[model samples]
Target: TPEMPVLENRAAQGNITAPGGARRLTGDQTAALRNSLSDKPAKNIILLIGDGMGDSEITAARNYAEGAGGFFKGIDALPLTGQYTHYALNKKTGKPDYVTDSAASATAWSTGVKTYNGALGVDIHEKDHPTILEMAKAAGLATGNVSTAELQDATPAALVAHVTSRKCYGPSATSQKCPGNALEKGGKGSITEQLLNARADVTLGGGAKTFAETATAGEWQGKTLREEAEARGYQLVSDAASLNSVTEANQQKPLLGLFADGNMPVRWLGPKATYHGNIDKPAVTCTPNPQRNDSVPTLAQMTDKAIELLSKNEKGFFLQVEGASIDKQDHAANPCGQIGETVDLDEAVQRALEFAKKEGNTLVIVTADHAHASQIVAPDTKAPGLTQALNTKDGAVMVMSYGNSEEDSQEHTGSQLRIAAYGPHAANVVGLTDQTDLFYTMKAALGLK
Candidate 1:
């Protein structure tokens, strides 16, 4: 039977004329590829998920920041390739053509199952499943979940808790459900119950408002998640300054650091506090102080702090960090914000890659949950090279002029997502695969049978 042709005829023909024809492998060469899989596994796993980022989104962000000829600034620097197919099984339809919500997409990546679009942790049948965090903890690996969204947002929540619906925000103090449900009992105790009870080693990012009582004007919760973690002997830090303060001095206890009441502000918003720069100077002059002086921390700083804290675990650790607003921008169909946020995400990826390069053994996987409508208009030589010149008034268009969007649209689109990887076993994630394959790929990298 001619051994069942491996490569497609076109793929085989392309490789056959190579200078080293015998050594050349076609894209469809499954036989030779199957035999060449590496036996060695990865030790540490750093999964970077850019929520709501697509291929065109990647291209646009890269083009806007680096110019038409330059590569995208941050994540493009990684060593892995992108994946094309990102289908998820819809619980109701039981078909693959379904578009995925962040919760379902996250569940597919974390639990290896196709769940309802808004469901978290629980599967199609509404059964609770252990998440990657649980698996990592069970395997004795330190685990942390970081995000720019509320800490309880679907993407981050998928890692440690299972819920049937994404809207189950632990009750605000004024709400009748203030005490929340059994799953989330409200307040700091409700939100941190999983972390405090499960004792996950590291916790970072925002959503302090949900855990805090309304009596404090949402500024501080009486028994805050921080206080609970500290009660359990976990070192707690809130702002960027306090986060930087902790090092080897208190590495023994698990660390819980929350920087904002909700999702942190975008990176271009500046730091949560002023230190080196003098406010009196013209260059350092403040703009009306958006919200508060110490509101949100930049993604880059958070990445640095996370890497510093998690690297202390001698038993190896698993960290999941998210560039959450990429999706929010996508949902709003705001090209300017999307690109800016995507650029911010790339910056964070750069920091993570830097950590990976220094650590060496860490397997860093960067990818997106799903894609959005904002796309890079294929460059035309006649147009201006600036993003601002690209006008959306002509129906969802993007200009080459720099910084911010003129209009925003809140919608999700069916676009192929991007995935990049670094370190051992990362190669397995490249090429076309279902989003669920990410879960298996992570397991394989960590030697989880």
Candidate 2:
């Protein structure tokens, strides 16, 4: 993370308000913060993905944060700027209006080529490519993944695994929708195996279900996935409290965090929520109360710990922190939820900026893989029947809803997204760039070649 923007301190720093505060970053601050060769040959890289954060999403988050308490975020402090054309190559489409899904979008940037939706680390031709995390590991650099959704979801999984189907995370064969049972290995394997085989040094976020054994309960198949991870020297943590429990000593080992059974509870979903499944089986069974109550780590906290541990590597590190539910709630057409997620992601961005400004040798980049179909508009008397546009069920407020399933019941848009960068080679991130360029950008920033 950048400076580890402690919320309280930032509020006191006038990040949100000011007597002489510049609404925009000052020219001197811009020059000081701009990406330059001076900050290059980067020792650390923090890539943050706001799953569905488009321009409007950011505005909503900013307003909401202020509404809460005039909280200013660190993401706004970055100086470099760029846009990303998030289309991916598919058998049917040639270009724009592509509306790619998370796997395909992440694949383009992670593998440096376009691939169809549901494809991870593979190109449009179904060929597997080396991902940044893979390259970093091969170069002896440590790596980690952090997200608000399942750690194995499309975005995070794209950084490590190569599979033809995104749905394969559960079962590959002999299953109608779940395909963990059938793959190139037929009914003989599990995709979780591949995830474990390529697991990052630090793994955090929800989706305990994906990593758990879905087949048998108890010791029927031997140690559960959680047990296997523990056996492998990974320190597992489930909540923000235990997450902070890692001492400087524990930082020497890999860390794994599963914050929720599936997706972490959203702003609308209170902490009292619980996921029910089998109890006897670790993977195949029920959810433990490890993350019960308000223990889930915020995006900022996750990034904080990720850097604290990944920095332990002498060769430096590559860490991907994702705000998974921004797009998800956007898809569900819930502006409140989407905006809340955006706020969380921005806090994480603050953490990165704090790290970059202090470390001076790290390259930090933030971008959304794609956009959603959502749009926002506030009250207006000029608009016909603006106040009573839609009747409320009870005490509900009239607010915009966006990215609802497309008329086709899906929610991606062919819109480009903003990219912000700080530290070495940050200038490379400027202008409109194809998503795949990110792969090369990171490589060059890290001097991988």
Candidate 3:
């Protein structure tokens, strides 16, 4: 089955269909740039992270979903755009490690501190720092963390948990993966436990399986985390309809939505990239993933609901929504999966933009954790690693190559990434900045300490 285009074809839309209409500028546009700049404080902050969405992944997705000349209404609509460097530190040497993992990169922005690969919400020295979400809560701003990956995944975990290793999802995993950091060892329990303690007004994502693992040590030891969360007065939600039923969320009754047992199934499915696949195989079109059914909540749906609930607070809110599976699919060399997640993230961005434009006082920022392996290549090229040929919305064949690894998962590249924003404090991203700068930007935007 062929899949339909994920986004509107801006190339085919009115005006853009004319010659030179694709050009965003009619003449000198000094006023548009001036109007986009703002230093005013924002009432709310919505951060949308597209995991492993480097320039290459974005171009590939745009090429397939929107055509080469087309634009993503969401990702491309941000008024202020710039590039940001994302680099982790060497744990042992305390030097720049260059290429960053999701955990470290997320920590850099969430806590305003560069960390070693695999560390969450901590500096290279293993010192814990206050995360943006935690600080926002302390300042009385409602907070939310939503993701397509498990809530304990690196990107979301950094917001609420500070662990030596990103692998510490729960008591059991903390005992093995984090060793001295287990609760019984007089350390923070786990990502899941800390997530509960952080208590954002809204927390939605996968990783329901981790909740099944009993707490090894703590007040709730021997009890499943699911039981602990509910006992602690969390409003548990597990499906799209249940998520919709949550009309309010606060410190007293925070929403805890676990949509899937693990990372949610991707939205699209197709053949994975293989050596010589582009040349030997016929160009393929993506198909809608059967596993993602009506019960599953799309990223945009989750964003809309999170914003609705969190914005109920008079103090406004700070929310982070992540399209996580893009990185995972890129690692697996699945072009369709990666592109589909990008489109999913773009929709999430669109939701944030809609809310920000209306609210006027909300700051909306879109970015990625790190760059990954996925490059558009000539269709006739025979790549050494993996390759796939896809039929795109432009009615043309496009080929992508993944060459970071010979046999293992594709590797993340040490490259600067695109950062775009709208509303107050959006000007902070206008020039080249470090990922750690994002913490200060969002903090200033929300007036959080």
Candidate 4:
């Protein structure tokens, strides 16, 4: 036979066609990330994404996650891998445009429909399309959206709201603009408002600024939208302390957790206070103020908690977790920041893998919305050592894109990035295909048509 074909690959050796290097894993690492020979029907789905995380970024993240006594993390251990080509419909020609933004890319996977750039949960021509979250909700299963960015950002927004502009985060009278920039009468409900109404069982992330306010003006005045969401059956939570409180014990209710006004602090930066996402909730140190990085409930914790809450429904659940800053820091060209961010994401993947293995009823996918050039090593050309000693020596030129060129080069690179899955129905992604297949297949795994 064809060797059972457990480990699927787009290219035989290298994941990408032409790459800087090949990555090898130890036997232990490979075993750690692998699923069992027999798979299970998914009662749960966990999607972990490192936005703009290319293979090079994953390598760097893996290295940083395991420095001296290095070991492969959860993402490294996935048994099945596949390649997907991403592009959006170019409005001008109705052809595929190679470069894709987070909005369009997320729209495709969230709704099984590809929209133009800047679209969210809508097909091209600004039409609404039901999202996987919506479908999951309709099926009486729990749905969750978690991210390091504002919960209302493109990737998270696509999971729920259908809008033409990514900027229509919330139609605040203070900032008056509808989904399509139309100035509507009596005021249109913000995407945040609509999302709360649409109902995702679990909503956790940094979007307090968008969702936690009352209209300074409106028919529904003097009421906080966040409070209304809770009234409609969501258990509102703002911090790690509140998040952990919503166990199965305390009167069953869906969860809505918003941690920051906008994007929260990066992992490595000092929230000063942090939560390790384990039973020992207060295990992390906090460094508040902008100087303070209080990711009390870390991304990993958020992932774990979301799974725990959503798994409550006997009907199973669909969960999406994003390591959002992998792209932001890549764009910033802050090498260490991006690395730490990726490490944080990998930790979440590690948690998800552990959960899937234990439950034996989950399907998990780890992928990136896109790729970024976190140039790790220059193999084609001679490379220098990790340099600390600098000298303005004649006939010597070594440049780093720290200041002048970061403005130009630190953008998303269109390429065949990596995707991996574990559990039942994962085998279908054995070769190059569209990402729609991956998210679309999740429904079938749930026994959906």
Against the correct fold, how does model 1 do in TM-score?
0.74
Best by lDDT: 3
Q: Tell me the TM-score of model 2.
A: 0.79
Candidate 1 lDDT, 355-381, residue by residue in tens: 766666677878888776554433232
Regarding lDDT, does 1 or 2 come out ahead? 2
Specify the highest-TM-score model's number.
3
**Candidate 2: where is the Cα deviation over 4 Å?**
1-39, 67-72, 92-97, 172-191, 214-223, 248-253, 268-294, 378-399, 403-410
**Backbone steric clashes in candidate 3, count:** 0
Candidate 1, residue 104: CA error in Å? 0.7
Cα lDDT over the full model 2 = 0.67
Number of colliding residue pairs in model 4: 17
Q: After superposing candidate 4, which stretches have Cα over 4 Å from the reference?
A: 1-40, 67-71, 173-188, 212-222, 248-252, 269-295, 379-409
Query: What range of 10 consecutive residues in model 1 has the weakest lDDT sum?
Result: 1-10
C-alpha RMSD for every candidate: 10.3, 8.8, 4.6, 9.0
Candidate 4 lDDT over residue span 93-153, tens digit each: 7688777889999988888887788877777676788788888888878888899899888
**What is the TM-score of candidate 4?**
0.79
- Write the candidate numbers in order of decreasing lDDT: 3, 4, 2, 1
Give the TM-scores of the predictions, in the order they appear: 0.74, 0.79, 0.96, 0.79
Off by over 4 Å in 3: 1-22
Candidate 1, superposed: residue stretches over 4 Å from native? 1-39, 171-192, 213-227, 248-252, 268-296, 378-409
**Cα lDDT for residue 385, model 3?**
87
Q: For residues 162-236, could you state the per-residue lDDT of candidate 2 as single tens digits? A: 777776664422244334334333432344545665757888888788656543422224456676666667777
